UniProtKB/Swiss-Prot annotation:
Quaternary structure, from the entry: Homohexamer.
Name of the protein described by the UniProt record: Inorganic pyrophosphatase
Location(s) in or outside the cell: Cytoplasm
GO MF annotations, alphabetized: inorganic diphosphate phosphatase activity; magnesium ion binding
Organism classification: Archaea, Methanobacteriati, Methanobacteriota, Thermococci, Thermococcales
Major location (coarse): cytoplasm
Keyword annotations: Cytoplasm, Hydrolase, Magnesium, Metal-binding
CDD domains documented for this protein: pyrophosphatase (cd00412)
Length: 172
């Protein structure tokens, strides 16, 4: 499994690895299976929405009983199971069915388009809104309730990554 076999990053928490599961623009929700290391179709979203970001996980992280999720803003979406060196710039805070389900927002290190993106204030506000709204509504036809706490900055993101990396060490 890229989850188990890779280190969290080449320079955590400044640069992490993101293992991409879902390319920006997919209505199919793919997940990396931790045991087999293969891509699985978790579900087809019940509504005609698409993932607004390249969506994945950081290797060797464990969060709150799952890998820590990362959203990577890519101009051209990558293929599932691509590794991206990503810079954390933000932290999305939502709770899904009582459980905290925070997500890191990151930019690709090797796309110079995002070179001056270093914190949440560098992101177009309507983009942060479109992400929050996606997670607020995407499971509404499945009867789930997601509460969205909002966003925090890069420093918070990076704390939470270091925290999830040690939680992985405790569990494995």
């Amino acid at each position: 499994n890229p989850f188990h076999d890779l280190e969290p990053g080449p320079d955590v928490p400044e640069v992490v690895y993101a293992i991409i599961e879902i390319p920006k623009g997919s209505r199919n929700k793919y997940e990396l299976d931790k045991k087999t290391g293969l891509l699985k179709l978790d579900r087809v979203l019940y509504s005609p929405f698409f993932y607004p970001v390249d969506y994945g996980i950081i290797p060797r992280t464990w969060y709150e009983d799952d890998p820590f999720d990362i959203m990577v803003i890519m101009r051209e979406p990558v293929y599932p199971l691509t590794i991206i060196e990503a810079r954390p710039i933000g932290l999305f805070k939502m709770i899904d069915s009582g459980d905290k389900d925070y997500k890191v927002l990151a930019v690709p290190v090797e796309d110079p388009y995002f070179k001056d993106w270093k914190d949440i204030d560098d992101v177009p506000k309507a983009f942060l809104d479109e992400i929050a709204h996606f997670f607020k509504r995407y499971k509404e036809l499945q009867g789930k309730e997601i509460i969205v706490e909002g966003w925090e900055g890069a420093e918070a993101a990076k704390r939470e990554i270091l925290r999830a990396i040690e939680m992985y060490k405790e569990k494995f």
